[PDB]
């Protein structure tokens, strides 16, 4: 009747094993299915557990099912940044139950990359061909560092993302900040979040 997924959001350092829970109030189910959804994309099926099953596996993914208790657990071994996505759980009725499935609200998962050699710095990037905006890049910080929003009206700070320079087996975090080509150097934009005291701020 009702599907509950907890935690609603999970943040963890890469390498850690993960546990995602799915609960349903009606034990009379035909099956349970787990899906993955990337931002702005569709639903990719991960595992399908039939009422007659108690466990299903696929690579680092494995899910259990306890119909009587109305529970299913998805385990993700040695998590990786690429596992970041929203995980959805759904159950379908049995014995002529309208076949109508019920979906949980999902668990938003973020697996942070391990940054071997943090080198936090804020850099100003010029031109768009000149006369456009003022853009700054906060980069190479450890994954524990959080980027908050600025207290200024004409200033924007993006969420952080990790890029991977494959050839060099090098990963780095970064967040972008910008304003409107005027009385405000963008390096000042980040002075609202907690950042390393040794962060490099070249002019």
């Amino acid at each position: 009747q009702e599907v509950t997924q907890i935690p609603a959001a999970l943040s963890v350092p890469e390498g850690e094993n993960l546990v995602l829970n799915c609960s349903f109030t009606d034990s009379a189910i035909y099956n349970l299915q787990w899906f993955r959804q990337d931002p702005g994309k569709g639903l990719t099926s991960l595992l399908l557990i039939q009422s007659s099953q108690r466990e299903q596996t696929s690579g680092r993914l494995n899910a259990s099912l306890d119909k009587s208790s109305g529970r299913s657990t998805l385990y993700i071994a040695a998590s990786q940044p690429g596992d970041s996505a929203t995980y959805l759980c759904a159950v379908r009725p049995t014995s002529g139950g309208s076949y109508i499935p019920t979906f949980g609200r999902g668990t938003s998962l973020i697996v942070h990359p391990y940054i071997q050699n943090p080198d936090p710095a804020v850099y100003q990037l010029r031109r768009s061909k000149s006369s456009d905006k003022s853009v700054c890049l906060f980069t190479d910080f450890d994954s524990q560092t959080n980027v908050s929003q600025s207290k200024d009206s004409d200033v924007y700070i993006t969420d952080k993302c990790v890029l991977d320079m494959r050839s060099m087996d090098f990963k780095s975090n970064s967040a972008v900040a910008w304003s409107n080509k005027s009385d405000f150097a963008c390096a000042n934009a980040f002075n609202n979040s907690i950042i390393p005291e040794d962060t490099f701020f070249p002019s």
């Binding site: 931002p39 639903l43 076949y99 979906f103 768009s128 853009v135 924007y156 969420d159 993302c161 320079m165």
Partner: protein, 241 residues
């Protein structure tokens, strides 16, 4: 597989539209869902078989038919702003395992006035000399701003080749006017290369953003170009400096 069309759509309030769903797996069961922020997936209509149709949780304002096994059309006779959502079609064999197969989704935005639709402005910002000296790496930033709705796809192309290595794009765009439901959006992306690669003047970097907007049939009475589906791009060339 399951194929739904269109993938993106903008409608003016009152306009009619049909979201198509086709599957070639001989699946007897087909259904439609709408997904809204924190609202989860809500069943709108479902069909247990050809010729059979039943309403779901939020059938209000939607019409479906199932004359054939392969198709399950979702029709909006008179689009309303509240119907702005992401629509998903899913199918499965009648009994079997119960495994559901989802389509890629259809992002629909219904607006009272199309004048609120804006294409993105795109700019590329070149690597900081300080970053180059400090890390021997060079990060380019692409900024797409002022667009609405949030129906875009950003990609980087280096010397004509689409690249994924050394790139990352914001998972979600940000609102330029936070309090507004129809705020225009901004999206950023980074492309990081070695300083030596950026220093080669022969290397060409292109950031392009595909924006899904109006059809070249919608009425447009603004003193600006009709915001139709298009690609907006910006580029840069490496420099020895």
């Amino acid at each position: 597989g399951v194929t739904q069309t269109p993938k993106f759509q903008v409608l003016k309030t009152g306009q009619s539209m049909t979201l198509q769903c086709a599957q070639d797996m001989n699946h007897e069961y087909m259904s439609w869902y709408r997904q809204d922020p924190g609202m989860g997936l809500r069943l709108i209509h479902y069909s247990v078989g050809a010729g059979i149709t039943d309403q779901g949780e939020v059938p209000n304002g939607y019409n479906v038919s199932r004359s054939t096994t392969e198709d399950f059309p979702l029709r909006l006779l008179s689009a309303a702003p509240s119907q702005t959502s992401v629509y998903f079609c899913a199918s499965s064999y009648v009994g079997n395992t119960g495994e559901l197969f989802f389509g890629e989704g259809s992002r629909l935005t219904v607006l009272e006035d199309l004048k609120n639709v804006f294409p993105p402005e795109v700019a590329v910002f070149e690597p900081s000399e300080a970053e180059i000296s400090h890390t021997q790496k060079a990060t380019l930033v692409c900024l797409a701003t002022g667009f609405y709705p949030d129906h875009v796809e950003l990609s980087w192309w280096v010397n004509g080749k689409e690249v994924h290595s050394g790139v990352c794009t914001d998972p979600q765009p940000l609102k330029e006017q936070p309090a507004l439901n129809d705020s225009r959006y901004a999206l950023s992306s980074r492309l990081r290369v070695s300083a030596t690669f950026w220093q080669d003047p022969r290397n060409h970097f292109r950031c392009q953003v595909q924006f899904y907007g109006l059809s070249e049939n919608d009425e447009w009475t603004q003193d600006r170009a009709k915001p139709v589906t298009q690609i907006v791009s910006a580029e840069a060339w490496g420099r020895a400096d």
